[PDB]
Structure 1
């Protein structure tokens, strides 16, 4: 018997086969979950990547900055899962910050429009998704978002760290609203993961100094983590998201679970 046997779960954020959400979707399906997927802009690309998941899952277009996509979301989901069926889980694995807000570009040089775009996609959208999906969620349901520990400032991450701080605050309020539906809302704070974007940054896409800093940050992470950290393996992160989607953390809400090898609990 699967951990998510009989659960209907919406998974957003797949772009490539290295996306954290691809691994969340794989593990959830291995655990008996019936999935509905949401994708942004490049849907032909997303459909081909998701064809490799162990089971079939309908794909729906969702640009979190689009008011029409959000207003029609619940109707499109229920149409994909069948009338009279509701979701048991929602996975928010969406994040973006324009290049001006990250890397070698000075912190003070990011124009507000770019910061605002990044916060809209990375933080506000967590509330936006919950607003659209809570009316079609079952009691005992679970909303999970992806976080990167922003409690301390760090090189290169810059305004994305600010967006994550706002996300953690948004999550605590989403928990208040979700509670009225008998639904939990939590974040998984993951360690660094070698996604296509991350590999590009290490490769110097956002500047040499930013690349050097991010590579050093990842090395320090594995060193600190009492059980180590493998940036090339998103499976421990995917399993943690599934733990929160399950009935096994029923008294946890407005909270953050750290899937970071325990690195944030250690100084050196």
Structure 2
């Protein structure tokens, strides 16, 4: 029997097979979950990518900044899962911060229009997806979002760290609302993962200094982590999301679970 047997789970955030959501989606399918997938912009590309998952799943378009996509979401999910059925899980694996607010651009040089777009996609949309999906979720259900520990400041992350701090606060309010439906809301704070944006910065796309800074963060993370940290392996992160989606953490809500090799609990 699978960890997610009989559970209907919506998974957002798939762009490539390197996406954390792809690995969440693959592990949930191996664990017997029935998926509904959401994608943004490059729908032709994600269709080809989602065809690489172990099982077939409906693919729905969802731009979190689009009010019409959100207003129709619940109805579109119902048509995909069939009338009389509700979701048991929701995975928010969405984030974006323009290069003006994250990378090499000075912290003070990020224009608010760009910071605002980043906070809309990365923090406010966790509340927006919860508003749209809670009326179609079963009691005992679970909403999971992806977090990057923003308790301490660090180089390059800049406005993304601010957006993550806003997301942590949003998660605590979403828990109050979701609790009325018997639904839990939690964040998984993952260690750094070699996704396309991460591979670009380490590889030198943002220059020598930025690459050296992220390489130092990765090296230090693995050193600090009592059990080590492998940036090239999204599996432990995907497994943690599936633990939260299961019925095995039923008294955890408005919380953060750290899937970071324990690096945040160690100074040196």
- SS of 2:193's partner is coil
How far does residue 104 in structure 1 lie from its aligned partner after superposition? 1.4
- Is 48-57 or 203-212 further displaced after alignment? 203-212
Map Cα deviations across residues 228-257 of structure 1 (whole Å, 9 max, x no partner).
000000000000000000000000000000
How far does residue 207 in structure 1 lie from its aligned partner after superposition? 3.4
CA distance in 1, matches of 2:76, 2:222: 42
CA distance in 1, matches of 2:58, 2:192: 29
Correspondence for 2:166: 166
**Do 1:74 and 1:132's aligned partners in 2 also have CA atoms closer than 8 Å?**
yes
- Is 204-213 or 137-146 further displaced after alignment? 204-213
CA distance in 1, matches of 2:105, 2:129: 31
**Do 1:142 and 1:245's aligned partners in 2 also have CA atoms closer than 8 Å?**
yes
CA distance in 2, matches of 1:260, 1:72: 36
Map Cα deviations across residues 32-78 of structure 1 (whole Å, 9 max, x no partner).
00000000000010010010100001000000000000000000001
CA distance in 2, matches of 1:103, 1:73: 33
CA distance in 1, matches of 2:62, 2:213: 33
CA distance in 2, matches of 1:176, 1:67: 23
Map Cα deviations across residues 65-105 of structure 1 (whole Å, 9 max, x no partner).
00000000000001000001000000000000000001111
Please tell me whether residue 65 in structure 1 is matched to residue 30 in structure 2.
no
How far does residue 206 in structure 1 lie from its aligned partner after superposition? 2.8
How far does residue 226 in structure 1 lie from its aligned partner after superposition? 0.5
CA distance in 2, matches of 1:104, 1:9: 37
CA distance in 2, matches of 1:191, 1:156: 16
Please, which runs of 5 or more residues in structure 2 have no aligned partner? Answer: none
**Do 1:172 and 1:255's aligned partners in 2 also have CA atoms closer than 8 Å?**
yes
How far does residue 22 in structure 1 lie from its aligned partner after superposition? 0.2
- Is 223-232 or 209-218 further displaced after alignment? 209-218
Map Cα deviations across residues 156-187 of structure 1 (whole Å, 9 max, x no partner).
00000000000000000000000000000000
CA distance in 2, matches of 1:259, 1:69: 31
Correspondence for 2:234: 234
- Is 3-12 or 199-208 further displaced after alignment? 199-208
- What is the 5 A alignment of 1:88-127? 88-127=88-127
Large movers: runs of 4+ above 3 Å: none
Q: How many residues align?
A: 268
CA distance in 1, matches of 2:103, 2:179: 38
- SS of 1:247's partner is coil
Map Cα deviations across residues 91-142 of structure 1 (whole Å, 9 max, x no partner).
0000000000011110000000000000000000000000000000000000
CA distance in 1, matches of 2:14, 2:207: 26
Correspondence for 1:265: 265
- Give me the CA root mean square deviation: 0.5
CA distance in 1, matches of 2:233, 2:125: 26
**Do 1:102 and 1:206's aligned partners in 2 also have CA atoms closer than 8 Å?**
no
